[PDB]
């Protein structure tokens, strides 16, 4: 289980524990998965998506049953295999981001570019630049949100945790059905209860009994 990000990432002055990343509460390193919506024209191939998220094109290709050079239709959700490891008490997958245009902000990078796979707070925590002092060409360390199964999760047969970007009209019920797991397992993975609010566009952890499907 990890705490639910719970829209705390929408305000850069928010300092809730969850905005700084999943907490290192299990094994030091593991296979994990991100999800990401293909965006044209910058991030719509395995090479460009893997460049943004620091995966490999072949891992993205095999995870989605495509070739490593196939274009991906815009808004297609793709799974991205990543290594998840502990760093300073947090689970995260490290990536790098070179700012393209002056005008980008810590929030625009977390919310738009990385589609809430990281947060304003974590970017600011792990980068020396001031929020007012970002420019085109600056290199940013990007802590992407991932986690490793706890002993209790592993004992129940969950081999991976997947970071799922929730879309409009989805619910814990519908998301669990995509991955062949019980709804309660998804709630438990995010320390939610049957009577909780889940937000569109916020990452949600999904425990997996096997590798995710090739198409979501």
């Amino acid at each position, epitope marked *: 289980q990890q705490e639910y990000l719970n*829209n705390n990432q*929408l305000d850069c002055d928010n300092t809730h524990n969850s905005t700084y990343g999943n907490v290192c509460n299990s094994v030091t390193s593991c296979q994990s998965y991100l999800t990401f919506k293909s965006s044209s024209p910058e991030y719509n191939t395995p090479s460009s998506i893997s460049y943004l998220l620091n995966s490999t094109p072949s891992l993205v290709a095999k995870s989605n049953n495509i070739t490593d050079v196939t274009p991906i239709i815009t808004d297609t959700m793709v799974t991205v295999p990543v290594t998840c490891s502990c760093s300073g008490g947090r689970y995260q997958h490290n990536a790098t981001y070179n700012l393209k245009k002056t005008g980008e902000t810590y929030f625009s990078i977390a919310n738009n570019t990385y589609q809430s796979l990281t947060t304003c707070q974590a970017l600011m925590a792990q980068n020396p630049y001031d929020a007012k002092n970002l420019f085109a060409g600056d290199d940013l360390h990007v802590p992407l949100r991932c986690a490793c199964p706890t002993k209790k999760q592993s004992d129940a047969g969950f081999k991976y945790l997947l970071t799922y970007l929730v879309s*409009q009209g*989805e619910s814990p019920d519908s998301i669990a059905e995509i991955f062949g797991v019980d709804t309660q397992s998804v709630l438990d993975a995010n320390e939610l209860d*049957s009577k909780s*609010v*889940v*937000f*569109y566009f916020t990452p949600l952890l999904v425990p997996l009994k096997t590798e995710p499907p090739a198409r979501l």
Partner: nanobody
Framework: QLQLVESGGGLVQAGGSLRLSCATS????????MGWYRQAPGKQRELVAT???????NYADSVKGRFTISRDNAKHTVDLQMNSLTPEDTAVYYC???????????????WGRGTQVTVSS
């Protein structure tokens, strides 16, 4: 969409107190202002207190000092502590939750089914 569950009303002696609470569940993009309204017999549904996500409050004049609104952003609940009640506080009390379903989209009213509060003479 969103489901609201109100609790904590009932019958109370004048001068007594009650605690109303409302829990929200379901899905949305953002939960904005939450609040409590009331409709006395023969009256309109009128604002009692609201509270924003950043805890900015707004109280009806007839209610300032006696009532206190609170908000739990971890579990998405809103509570109304009602002290020094009078028969003029007898009403059906409704929780209001405002939500948005996309970035910069319209805001929607979500109303609970209402909880009866009756204050005896």
């Amino acid at each position: 969409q969103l489901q609201l569950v109100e609790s904590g009303g009932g019958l109370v002696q004048a001068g007594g107190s009650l605690r109303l609470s409302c829990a929200t569940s379901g899905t949305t993009f953002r939960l904005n202002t939450m609040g409590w309204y009331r409709q006395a017999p023969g009256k309109q549904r009128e604002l009692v207190a609201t509270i924003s996500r950043d805890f900015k409050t707004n109280y009806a004049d007839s209610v300032k000092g006696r009532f206190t609104i609170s908000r739990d952003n971890a579990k998405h609940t809103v509570d109304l502590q009602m002290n020094s009640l009078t028969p003029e506080d007898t009403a059906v009390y409704y929780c209001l939750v405002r939500d948005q379903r996309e970035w910069y989209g319209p805001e929607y009213d979500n109303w609970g089914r209402g909880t009866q509060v009756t204050v005896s003479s």
